[PDB]
Design a protein around this motif. Structure first.
Motif, mmCIF file in Angstrom:
data_model
loop_
_atom_site.group_PDB
_atom_site.id
_atom_site.type_symbol
_atom_site.label_atom_id
_atom_site.label_comp_id
_atom_site.label_asym_id
_atom_site.label_seq_id
_atom_site.Cartn_x
_atom_site.Cartn_y
_atom_site.Cartn_z
ATOM 1 N N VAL A 83 -45.014 -24.245 -57.729
ATOM 2 C CA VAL A 83 -45.051 -23.321 -56.605
ATOM 3 C C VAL A 83 -45.368 -21.986 -57.292
ATOM 4 N N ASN A 84 -46.544 -21.442 -57.011
ATOM 5 C CA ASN A 84 -46.966 -20.202 -57.642
ATOM 6 C C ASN A 84 -46.526 -18.921 -56.926
ATOM 7 N N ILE B 16 -33.572 -22.194 -57.547
ATOM 8 C CA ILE B 16 -34.811 -22.081 -56.785
ATOM 9 C C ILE B 16 -35.993 -21.600 -57.622
ATOM 10 N N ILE B 17 -35.820 -20.493 -58.334
ATOM 11 C CA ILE B 17 -36.902 -19.949 -59.155
ATOM 12 C C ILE B 17 -37.393 -20.914 -60.239
ATOM 13 N N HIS B 18 -36.469 -21.595 -60.910
ATOM 14 C CA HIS B 18 -36.848 -22.546 -61.951
ATOM 15 C C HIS B 18 -37.461 -23.819 -61.362
ATOM 16 N N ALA B 19 -36.848 -24.361 -60.310
ATOM 17 C CA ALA B 19 -37.368 -25.567 -59.660
ATOM 18 C C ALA B 19 -38.755 -25.300 -59.101
ATOM 19 N N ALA B 20 -38.964 -24.092 -58.581
ATOM 20 C CA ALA B 20 -40.255 -23.717 -58.022
ATOM 21 C C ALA B 20 -41.316 -23.784 -59.108
ATOM 22 N N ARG C 59 -43.961 -30.658 -50.594
ATOM 23 C CA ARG C 59 -45.119 -29.989 -51.170
ATOM 24 C C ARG C 59 -45.129 -28.531 -50.710
ATOM 25 N N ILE C 60 -44.376 -27.692 -51.419
ATOM 26 C CA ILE C 60 -44.242 -26.272 -51.091
ATOM 27 C C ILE C 60 -45.342 -25.395 -51.683
ATOM 28 N N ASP C 61 -45.851 -24.470 -50.880
ATOM 29 C CA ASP C 61 -46.889 -23.546 -51.328
ATOM 30 C C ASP C 61 -46.302 -22.158 -51.568
ATOM 31 N N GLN C 62 -45.317 -21.781 -50.753
ATOM 32 C CA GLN C 62 -44.665 -20.475 -50.855
ATOM 33 C C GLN C 62 -43.163 -20.584 -50.652
ATOM 34 N N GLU D 195 -39.876 -11.519 -62.906
ATOM 35 C CA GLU D 195 -40.751 -10.814 -63.850
ATOM 36 C C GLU D 195 -41.003 -11.646 -65.105
ATOM 37 N N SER D 196 -39.965 -12.318 -65.590
ATOM 38 C CA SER D 196 -40.057 -13.147 -66.789
ATOM 39 C C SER D 196 -40.943 -14.376 -66.596
ATOM 40 N N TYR D 197 -40.916 -14.975 -65.399
ATOM 41 C CA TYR D 197 -41.755 -16.139 -65.094
ATOM 42 C C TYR D 197 -43.182 -15.675 -64.864
ATOM 43 N N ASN D 198 -43.342 -14.461 -64.341
ATOM 44 C CA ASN D 198 -44.669 -13.894 -64.125
ATOM 45 C C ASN D 198 -45.330 -13.627 -65.479
ATOM 46 N N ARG D 199 -44.576 -13.014 -66.389
ATOM 47 C CA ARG D 199 -45.055 -12.701 -67.734
ATOM 48 C C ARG D 199 -45.350 -13.956 -68.569
ATOM 49 N N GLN D 200 -44.367 -14.845 -68.694
ATOM 50 C CA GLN D 200 -44.530 -16.060 -69.486
ATOM 51 C C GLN D 200 -45.464 -17.106 -68.907
ATOM 52 N N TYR D 201 -45.289 -17.455 -67.639
ATOM 53 C CA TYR D 201 -46.088 -18.519 -67.036
ATOM 54 C C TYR D 201 -47.232 -18.117 -66.125
ATOM 55 N N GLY D 202 -47.435 -16.822 -65.947
ATOM 56 C CA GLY D 202 -48.506 -16.370 -65.085
ATOM 57 C C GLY D 202 -48.219 -16.659 -63.628
ATOM 58 N N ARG D 203 -46.944 -16.641 -63.253
ATOM 59 C CA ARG D 203 -46.551 -16.873 -61.864
ATOM 60 C C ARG D 203 -46.765 -15.624 -60.987
ATOM 61 N N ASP D 204 -46.554 -15.790 -59.685
ATOM 62 C CA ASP D 204 -46.716 -14.709 -58.720
ATOM 63 C C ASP D 204 -45.413 -14.609 -57.908
ATOM 64 N N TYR D 205 -44.338 -14.246 -58.607
ATOM 65 C CA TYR D 205 -43.015 -14.111 -58.018
ATOM 66 C C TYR D 205 -42.721 -12.648 -57.753
ATOM 67 N N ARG D 206 -42.840 -12.276 -56.483
ATOM 68 C CA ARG D 206 -42.644 -10.912 -56.022
ATOM 69 C C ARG D 206 -41.224 -10.689 -55.490
#
Lengths: 317, 317
Positions: free
Chosen positions: A97-98, A88-92, A53-56, A146-157
């Motif tokens: 995992v936001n 990692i990015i896709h599995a997250a 159960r990952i948060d970050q 950036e693409s996951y942030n735009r499409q899914y509203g993620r917070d990938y910095r």
């Protein structure tokens, strides 16, 4: 209690981030070794994110190396970095995992970029041939975020560090990075009482260096910033943040300081019959400073402590 | 007898390549549908290359779409294209497939590139925002090829087509590509006997178009060239080859020609109160011509046959 996964926690940057998060109880670390979790395996990575159960996520895992390695194994560098990032990015995302922080590199900038290099210098010109495969993989990592942030509203910095150094670096003779290479050479020259140490080039080119602990601190800082604050200081399609000192120094000053730190009494000689690289190369850290972060470790101080680490661990190289 | 795998043989370019290779017995085609072989699955792709005996690979599978799709699903476009490229290229190498042709796109070039665009224009400036995620994935595909060629001595070639059109294109109302969009609109306007058809813009910008059958022909040509001939006309780190006509025409000329081909008697009107895109955009096909390939299908001829195809298949859109 935040459950944090640090991918590649044994590497130089990964371990630095781990060292600092371990020093606080509001965070619980989930760590897996390369033997426990194969990052190149999509199914394995998805299974892991499904079970835990990952948060970050601090994406610090990467296939890194020097000049020889990047030119000798170009396919391994582009392929492995692309797979690790994608998995990692896709599995997250698939497992809700936001929050995620992607650690890039300074190699992503154009060879002939304007100095100091602001974030907007990305993709503005041709890359350094030596680093091309690795750089393309890193840029793809930023664009995935950036693409996951735009499409899914993620917070990938994502953060792009300048030249790093510190404990757990590759002090082996094969490593081309100037700091660990010079620390090693000056150490042996001092031990063997060599009259001089010849360094190729004129010593005039300027470079920027950041201690890995300062890197870890900036990383955690950016990761923990309020989403509104981060959004306010970045753009959806130009979201990375340069991490560095913004201070440059000549190779001559660097060599001379290392000589002092190690206690070398011989002569430092620069052979100007050998070519220099670009005259100057440093990051514009305006964006980072406006986010309220400033480095603490100065060069002399960082080299002294790094040398100390090398001394207590030399029987590994 | 050469055993050839055409990934994505049902797509527009894939099917065009298949149509032409089927017309010769010195080649035996190995084809798998998306249902039979999941290209996003690493294990599935490796298993396939291990079980089958492939000699050549035409990597024509891709997640493609129009303006709306690329801006609406950016994550799917970068991720899926990166996975498909990585899986096939790596599995191919792991199983000794020495020959591979990667089909890229024209979107990979800088938004403000010098016209006509030579291959060396790659990575020289910022990308068109709309196509950024897809473009990054395509560029990574080219660099994977070059990296495997450099490291493992592979023969992974790549071609970048200009705007394509022809049978099996997306004639749905949702498609933003000018040719299928206009063929559809002029067809209905003709059928409904509409007095006019209004097109946004001034009609002055210039574009380049290539029929998909000419694309397939150039692809097979480049794939089959002698390795020494290919090496002689490319560079290890600038290996892609532009495929196109090198001829440009205004949107006005294009619209007017489509109107004629369809038998539309109304008026074609350009609304100049709407903005145009870049003034001109076409590829420099010098490298391709020097490799001895020239297109055969002219615009009028290609639109007429494409319209004919649309007529016999309209009950699909």
């Amino acid at each position: 209690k935040q459950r944090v996964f640090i991918a590649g926690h044994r590497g130089m940057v990964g371990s630095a981030i781990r060292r600092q998060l371990e020093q606080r109880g509001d965070v619980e670390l989930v760590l897996r070794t390369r033997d426990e979790l194969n990052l190149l395996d999509s199914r394995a990575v998805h299974d892991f994110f499904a079970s835990e159960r990952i948060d970050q996520v601090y994406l610090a895992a990467a296939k890194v190396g020097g000049i020889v390695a990047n030119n000798t194994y170009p396919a391994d560098f582009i392929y492995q970095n692309m797979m690790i990032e994608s998995n990692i990015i896709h599995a997250a995302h698939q497992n809700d995992v936001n929050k995620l922080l992607f650690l890039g590199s300074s190699c992503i900038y154009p060879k002939l970029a304007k100095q100091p290099m602001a974030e907007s210098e990305l993709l503005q010109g041709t890359l350094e041939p030596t680093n091309e495969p690795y750089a393309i993989a890193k840029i793809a990592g930023i664009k995935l975020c950036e693409s996951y942030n735009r499409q899914y509203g993620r917070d990938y910095r994502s953060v792009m560090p300048t030249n790093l150094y510190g404990p757990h670096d590759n002090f082996h003779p094969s490593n081309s990075h100037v700091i660990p290479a010079l620390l090693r050479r000056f150490h042996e020259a001092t031990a063997q009482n060599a009259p001089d140490v010849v360094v190729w080039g004129s010593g005039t080119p300027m470079r920027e260096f950041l201690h890995v602990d300062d890197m870890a601190a900036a990383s955690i800082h950016v990761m923990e910033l309020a989403h509104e604050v981060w959004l306010e200081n970045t753009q959806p399609m130009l979201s990375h943040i340069n991490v560095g000192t913004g201070v440059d120094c000549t190779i001559r000053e660097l060599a001379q300081t290392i000589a002092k730190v190690v206690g070398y009494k011989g002569r430092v000689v620069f052979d100007a019959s050998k070519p220099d690289g670009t005259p100057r190369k440093l990051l514009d850290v305006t964006r980072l400073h406006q986010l309220g972060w400033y480095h603490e470790i100065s060069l002399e101080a960082g080299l002294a402590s790094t040398y100390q680490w090398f001394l207590e661990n030399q029987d590994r190289f």
